Amino acid sequence: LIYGNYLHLEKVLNAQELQSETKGNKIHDEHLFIITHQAYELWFKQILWELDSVREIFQNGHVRDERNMLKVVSRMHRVSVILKLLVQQFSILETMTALDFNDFREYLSPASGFQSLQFRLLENKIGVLQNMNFKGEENELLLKSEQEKTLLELVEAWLERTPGLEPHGFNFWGKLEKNITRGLEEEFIRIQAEEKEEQVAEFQKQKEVLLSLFDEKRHEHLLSKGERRLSYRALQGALMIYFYREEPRFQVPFQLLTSLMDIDSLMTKWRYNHVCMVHRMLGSGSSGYHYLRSTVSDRYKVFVDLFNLSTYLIPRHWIPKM
Amino acid sequence: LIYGNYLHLEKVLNAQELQSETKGNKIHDEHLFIITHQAYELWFKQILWELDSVREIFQNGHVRDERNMLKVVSRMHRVSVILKLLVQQFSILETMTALDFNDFREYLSPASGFQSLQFRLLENKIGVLKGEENELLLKSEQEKTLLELVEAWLERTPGLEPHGFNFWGKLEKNITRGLEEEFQVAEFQKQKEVLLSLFDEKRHEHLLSKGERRLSYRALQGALMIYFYREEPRFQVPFQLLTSLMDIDSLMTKWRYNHVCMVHRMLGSGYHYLRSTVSDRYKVFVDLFNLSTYLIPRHWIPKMNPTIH
Amino acid sequence: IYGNYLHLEKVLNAQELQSETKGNKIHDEHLFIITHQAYELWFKQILWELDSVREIFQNGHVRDERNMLKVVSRMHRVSVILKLLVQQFSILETMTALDFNDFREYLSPASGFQSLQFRLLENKIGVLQNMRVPYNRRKGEENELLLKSEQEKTLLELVEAWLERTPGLEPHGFNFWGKLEKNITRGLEEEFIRIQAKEEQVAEFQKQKEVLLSLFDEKRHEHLLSKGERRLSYRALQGALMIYFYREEPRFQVPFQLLTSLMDIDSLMTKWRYNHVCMVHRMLGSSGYHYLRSTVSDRYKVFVDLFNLSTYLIPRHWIPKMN
Amino acid sequence: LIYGNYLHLEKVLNAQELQSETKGNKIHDEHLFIITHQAYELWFKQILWELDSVREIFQNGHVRDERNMLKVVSRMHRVSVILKLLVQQFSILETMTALDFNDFREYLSPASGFQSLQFRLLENKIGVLKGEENELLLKSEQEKTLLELVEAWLERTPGLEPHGFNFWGKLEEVLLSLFDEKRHEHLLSKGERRLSYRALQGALMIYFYREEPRFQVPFQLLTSLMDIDSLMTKWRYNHVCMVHRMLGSKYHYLRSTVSDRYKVFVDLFNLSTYLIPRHWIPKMNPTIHK
Ligand code: HEM
Ligand code: HEM
Ligand code: HEM
Ligand code: HEM
Ligand SMILES: OC1(c2cc(Cl)cc3[nH]ncc23)CCCCC1
Ligand SMILES: OC1(c2cc(Cl)cc3[nH]ncc23)CCCCC1
Ligand SMILES: OC1(c2cc(Cl)cc3[nH]ncc23)CCCCC1
Ligand SMILES: OC1(c2cc(Cl)cc3[nH]ncc23)CCCCC1
Ligand SMILES: N[C@@H](Cc1c[nH]c2ccccc12)C(=O)O
Ligand SMILES: N[C@@H](Cc1c[nH]c2ccccc12)C(=O)O
Ligand SMILES: N[C@@H](Cc1c[nH]c2ccccc12)C(=O)O
């Protein structure tokens, strides 16, 4: 068995066809444009392989066995490490001037980054909302990616099964509501001296944000608008994991929720470096840099609710005692 | 024209075949081992594409027109930026455990990184000391390496002519002078030998005979002229050039060094040969790195008069 | 010596956990402090390069071309430092939101707006005060150090005083400006007769034509200048293009490198701003966070002008051939 | 309470005194040499802070309460992330040339990196084989070190109990030499290995059964510790490369610090040379891993 055939280099190293050269005008730099894209595409392929396997571990019910938690977390972690490398690859393409790009730009229409299947599958499989062309079996794979359970949904189901939520067990939700309410009364009774009412106003801010956690109708309204993604119950699971992270059963789960936020951030870091590049090369649906600039928002953060949990931080003493 | 077709994705994204799976025991991590390789190989091809283009500009006489020096330097820079990323790219494969590698290791046999054609071309084309692919490989040994092209170009540096600036004559004079000026006998007597030893062609012509040096003597003087008068406008960009060349060398060693760590993390203690590639033995531009041990006080540097610009 | 040379008796006695001095030591506060100290140590150094580069422009002896190697290589060093500053945020990412919240209270009134060095850094590069987005909605001899910094010459101002004097712009010399507008007309007229031989590139042509010729609109330039969009004088804009188009010309090689650095700085600063705000979001949720997302706009890019050059890329065979 | 006060910047940003002004002529590039050094020393301090508190959780015995494993692994990992930055950090000082260095090198002598307290503190607390700086050096030579603490912990690893799970046992060609306990203690007597015989099998158990819930975060601690070792080496190698970029060849000793002899956690490294087919690993029964 030969290194070359094992790696299928007869394919990989035979895939660089310069359009400029095909049209009787080799432009040196077009070869960088191709290589850079094909390397990202191999890594998208690998992200999909990691990400699909973790999806099966939840689909399966195999996550129901903690033994498998180390597999899920270190493949999530592996996605991050790849995504990080992806962000740093931009540095290679910055060694291309706009003037070198402008010599070959024309040979490129009407191709677009939107024709990237794997990028779309990736967004879909993670759980990018969809309300926010392709043919044949590519179009199949895409519909499978829009219809199969997403990593977001699979995680939401696992969150919804967190130990601690049982109102006849630990009763987390119920005591958290009770301790926050007692907490605030304490803070109100204290605050009674009189130009520090900065403190009264800062109190009234704290109270609105903390007691809003307990407003399920609010959350539903927010879900149907798209501004939150996890079901209310999922949210109670994720807070339980955050608040009781040191407990052994919650340690590796807490790492997972941390990875999920890493992947999201890093997806954003990607998008933001794509937008800076576009701006370097070209200046200023699609408008068309303006559509991209648009994708750098929280609207593309699949794990938005995990980030926002940090808004419902409380003094340590108010956390129900386990 | 479609993204996927333009990038020949029907080849790139159809090249992953898990030997373990083919052999009826699919192991998850093998896919990472293939992709990582395949991505290193893409960039080797890029590095080779930049290198050959640069090689050609020397071989071509195009370097003689200073208009071209920016294309040389910016391409060389680019190779170094790739290599930097190639170095960072090991961190992906470190997410694979010895224990996991072990599960598909056996299916790899007897394949070897020695059978990477491109890595080997790379070394040859820079300069470092099987079917039809032999054609490419033999070609890359016969043909002028980057070391040689840079050497030719160094030999022709402005400022060495004995009836022009006479740089080497003036350097020697200033050096034997500075020395007897102040003149712990062991501090002086053992900074003497290395300094004036810059002028004994003989230790030079000798060291070139046991691989210790690579550039020729005139090549040396050129490099030093550039080193010393780097600020004079016509030396600006060529100084950058020598910097990139050194950068290429370092980072090539960095790659070799991290591959060595990988091997150790997977296989423990082939391996012992790889460690020896982390040597100066594999530094194509040793002579340029050592053009720092010949730092002198700025007073001893021969003064520019109304030269050329 | 090593110790005293580095003033380590000072560097390594600057760590005071405000939490601990309230009898409630929070392990993580110490990381929060060290991380800032290292950023500020590197601001001091960006300021040393930047000020020295500022000085080579001021000392007159920039138009002695022998110094360009200095200007350019210290600018590149600014760049490598900020690259490291961007990677440095990953250290502080290992601190969780829960743990930040066990020390955060001991921090008020302190605010990071009170980084002298960061305000100095923005100012010497040339971000302007009328350019700033107000927080909500608005010192000492530190005001006197800062006070100079906005009134003195900004790196932008000083680079612009170098671009004005770019060779090839004398109307009786090479006349780059003149020759450029004349050649575009003819490429455009030639192209117009090409298309006339749906598509629906009649639309595409007209958009190309308006964009290109508005470069020669000195009026429309000063409209956008006096507003805030553009930052360089029409004549500085003119020499920068010279350098872009003729950059292979020996005397323009290193200057084009200059122009590349200045763009890297603004890119790298924005990247810094953007990581600092990613960091606010994970510690604080989703307000200071609003204003920060505001600084990551192009309003804060001091060399927005050079980036904009890319829209006024023309076909190669239209750049005035030079004898 | 104010930013600069809180950060003690009047002290931090007033340590920059270059021996170029105070001897003749301000050479610009010395400023970088000092700030790089100062930044490494700040991170060294931070590394000492995390590394000390991890030590303390082991001495305390707080480690036996598994609640705290997250805090241990997470702080070891932060050490890693810090070390990775300190490796990327050399990239700043490679923007100074040999030539500009030589112009101020004269005036540094005879300061030495051998004189860095924190470096030697950090090397000793991890457990790598003078003014009252030496009261702090001495404790660090005698205070129980992260390698020992971990060894202590490794001794108590479940599934070792000679009548319990009795992991040592076995099959049925470099693997039988794991079982020569004299041969092993003779390596340790020379110091080509560092953990005690029992501590050795704590680790192989954690290795071989890493999936088992109570072993997961411990498998991360071991992985983390290897990492800190690789990162320290890689720092040494980059530090050696600097030296050669500046002073050229003919230094010979620093090469020798880039060896295995300076891997504190060599045992961990080679405990993944012991690699058997999955079919051979001993099976599992009633599990005391919650
Ligand atoms: C010269 C460098 C590049 C330029 C000027 C550039 C330009 C653009 C532009 C203008 C768009 C907007 C969509 C459109 O109008 O077609 C876009 C989208 C895209 N580009 Fe690039 N691009 C570059 C490099 C890359 C690279 C290296 C990748 C990596 C695979 C990439 C992947 C994409 C993807 C996936 C999209 C669609 C993304 C989305 O939905 O947000 N591009 N690109
Ligand atoms: C999975 C971890 C890896 C292990 C255990 C490993 C192991 C080895 C070993 C033992 C050798 C030398 C002897 C031989 O080939 O039989 C070698 C050589 C080589 N490997 Fe790897 N390797 C790994 C990953 C990589 C990667 C990612 C690349 C990137 C292309 C690579 C490229 C090479 C090359 C080019 C050679 C020949 C290099 C030379 O002559 O210095 N290997 N590998
Ligand atoms: C725990 C991590 C951090 C948090 C939560 C944080 C928080 C904030 C917030 C909320 C602001 C907005 C203004 C305000 O309300 O005070 C701000 C501004 C600032 N922060 Fe941070 N910060 C963090 C880390 C850093 C770091 C590591 C630095 C590095 C020196 C830094 C330097 C600054 C500076 C200079 C500003 C002013 C920036 C501007 O005016 O746009 N911060 N910070
Ligand atoms: C121009 C760059 C530098 C050069 C030429 C250099 C040179 C050296 C040399 C020659 C030695 C060994 C002999 C001796 O100290 O007399 C050494 C040791 C050392 N240097 Fe540096 N150094 C540089 C930068 C740095 C930096 C940035 C640090 C980080 C704090 C540093 C920290 C050390 C330490 C901690 C040691 C002793 C540790 C050991 O035995 O491995 N040096 N240096
Ligand atoms: O032709 C473009 C392109 C072409 C190809 Cl093949 C891949 C791309 N990734 N991102 C952009 C892109 C580059 C110019 C802007 C429109 C799309
Ligand atoms: O089979 C090995 C190998 C196989 C292949 Cl396909 C590529 C490789 N790069 N580096 C090593 C290497 C990996 C295990 C050690 C023997 C060589
Ligand atoms: O107290 C804050 C702060 C305090 C200090 Cl000391 C440094 C800071 N950098 N960025 C923010 C920041 C941190 C939380 C929000 C208000 C400002
Ligand atoms: O003065 C020297 C030095 C001085 C100082 Cl201050 C810090 C150093 N780190 N590494 C080396 C070193 C630099 C040259 C080699 C001897 C020590
Ligand atoms: N893995 C188990 C238990 C579980 C669910 N969610 C969790 C969250 C944290 C800890 C454990 C769990 C399950 O799938 O039902
Ligand atoms: N470019 C000219 C002059 C030259 C040769 N070597 C150089 C080195 C540095 C500067 C110029 C040169 C040539 O190739 O003959
Ligand atoms: N925490 C317990 C049990 C223990 C020791 N080492 C371990 C390794 C893995 C799992 C548990 C342990 C103790 O320190 O005695």
Side-chain angles (χ1 to χ4, degrees), chain A residues 242-253:
Chain A
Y242 285 156
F243 284 172
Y244 302 105
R245 78 247 251 156
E246 339 233 37
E247 297 315 330
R249 354 109 94 167
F250 292 145
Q251 293 171 173
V252 179

Side-chain angles (χ1 to χ4, degrees), chain B residues 28-57:
Chain B
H28 172 79
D29 268 10
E30 193 189 346
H31 201 277
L32 194 68
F33 185 86
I34 292 166
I35 299 289
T36 296
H37 280 79
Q38 273 171 359
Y40 272 109
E41 289 293 340
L42 284 177
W43 286 119
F44 287 168
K45 208 211 167 103
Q46 185 59 40
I47 290 177
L48 300 167
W49 175 269
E50 297 290 342
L51 232 84
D52 290 326
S53 92
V54 164
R55 275 180 67 261
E56 188 60 17
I57 294 166

Side-chain angles (χ1 to χ4, degrees), chain A residues 1-3 6-7, chain B residues 33 37 101 105 108-114 259 267:
Chain A
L1 178 69
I2 292 164
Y3 182 86
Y6 168 72
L7 302 168
Chain B
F33 185 86
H37 280 79
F101 184 61
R105 213 274 212 66
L108 289 192
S109 178
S112 180
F114 296 132
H259 182 254
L267 316 170

Side-chain angles (χ1 to χ4, degrees), chain A residues 61-193 195-280:
Chain A
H62 283 188
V63 223
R64 295 173 105 110
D65 190 351
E66 326 293 356
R67 282 170 127 278
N68 299 299
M69 208 73 80
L70 177 82
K71 223 190 248 137
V72 172
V73 156
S74 70
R75 296 184 185 170
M76 292 321 273
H77 182 261
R78 178 180 292 171
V79 166
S80 279
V81 163
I82 305 157
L83 276 170
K84 272 213 52 195
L85 193 90
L86 295 190
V87 171
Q88 281 153 29
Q89 274 187 186
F90 284 105
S91 73
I92 292 177
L93 211 62
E94 306 176 24
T95 72
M96 179 175 74
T97 302
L99 235 97
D100 324 300
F101 184 70
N102 194 243
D103 298 334
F104 78 88
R105 200 255 225 76
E106 76 190 312
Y107 303 112
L108 255 41
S109 347
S112 167
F114 301 139
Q115 289 130 47
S116 169
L117 174 65
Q118 275 199 135
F119 182 87
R120 222 81 21 193
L121 289 175
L122 185 54
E123 285 183 328
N124 281 351
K125 287 181 182 262
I126 303 181
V128 176
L129 58 194
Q130 280 178 53
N131 44 23
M132 230 91 289
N133 319 110
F134 284 84
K135 273 208 78 35
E137 105 91 1
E138 304 204 340
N139 189 255
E140 290 287 326
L141 253 17
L142 195 66
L143 256 352
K144 283 179 104 273
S145 86
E146 253 130 39
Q147 256 177 132
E148 309 183 321
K149 260 157 162 98
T150 58
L151 174 74
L152 170 76
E153 288 169 300
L154 289 162
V155 162
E156 182 194 41
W158 157 89
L159 295 173
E160 266 181 58
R161 293 199 296 279
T162 307
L165 302 165
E166 318 71 26
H168 296 115
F170 188 53
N171 193 27
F172 185 58
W173 218 236
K175 332 174 133 133
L176 183 69
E177 193 167 3
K178 188 190 258 53
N179 292 183
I180 287 153
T181 298
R182 176 272 316 163
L184 309 162
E185 278 75 311
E186 255 127 49
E187 230 186 298
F188 206 51
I189 284 135
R190 203 255 283 176
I191 301 167
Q192 228 91 314
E195 189 154 302
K196 310 174 94 81
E197 74 120 56
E198 261 195 41
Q199 278 156 246
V200 184
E202 173 102 64
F203 174 71
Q204 277 156 16
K205 269 186 214 85
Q206 181 202 207
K207 192 196 211 172
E208 265 169 43
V209 184
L210 295 173
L211 303 194
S212 65
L213 204 66
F214 294 101
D215 189 341
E216 195 175 6
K217 334 282 304 158
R218 213 206 170 237
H219 186 79
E220 269 147 39
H221 184 292
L222 284 197
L223 266 165
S224 53
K225 278 166 130 81
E227 294 193 59
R228 287 201 157 248
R229 312 283 308 280
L230 291 174
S231 71
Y232 193 65
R233 197 195 170 87
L235 253 210
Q236 303 174 347
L239 272 174
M240 178 99 187
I241 297 169
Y242 285 156
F243 284 172
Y244 302 105
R245 78 247 251 156
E246 339 233 37
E247 297 315 330
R249 354 109 94 167
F250 292 145
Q251 293 171 173
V252 179
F254 175 71
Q255 308 173 145
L256 175 64
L257 298 186
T258 298
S259 267
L260 293 171
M261 292 189 287
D262 295 344
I263 288 166
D264 241 2
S265 289
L266 271 167
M267 291 304 284
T268 310
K269 250 131 160 305
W270 192 84
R271 285 177 172 114
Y272 161 93
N273 294 225
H274 185 263
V275 97
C276 293
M277 166 104 274
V278 176
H279 189 47
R280 256 180 72 98

Side-chain angles (χ1 to χ4, degrees), chain D residues 63-64 66 153 156-158 206 214-215 218:
Chain D
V63 192
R64 280 137 177 273
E66 316 220 16
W153 177 74
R156 308 186 304 287
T157 295
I206 291 163
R214 277 174 68 201
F215 294 147

Side-chain angles (χ1 to χ4, degrees), chain D residues 136-148:
Chain D
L136 283 59
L137 215 119
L138 278 177
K139 317 173 79 72
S140 99
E141 322 198 287
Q142 292 147 3
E143 287 232 21
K144 208 142 186 72
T145 70
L146 185 84
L147 168 91
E148 289 146 348

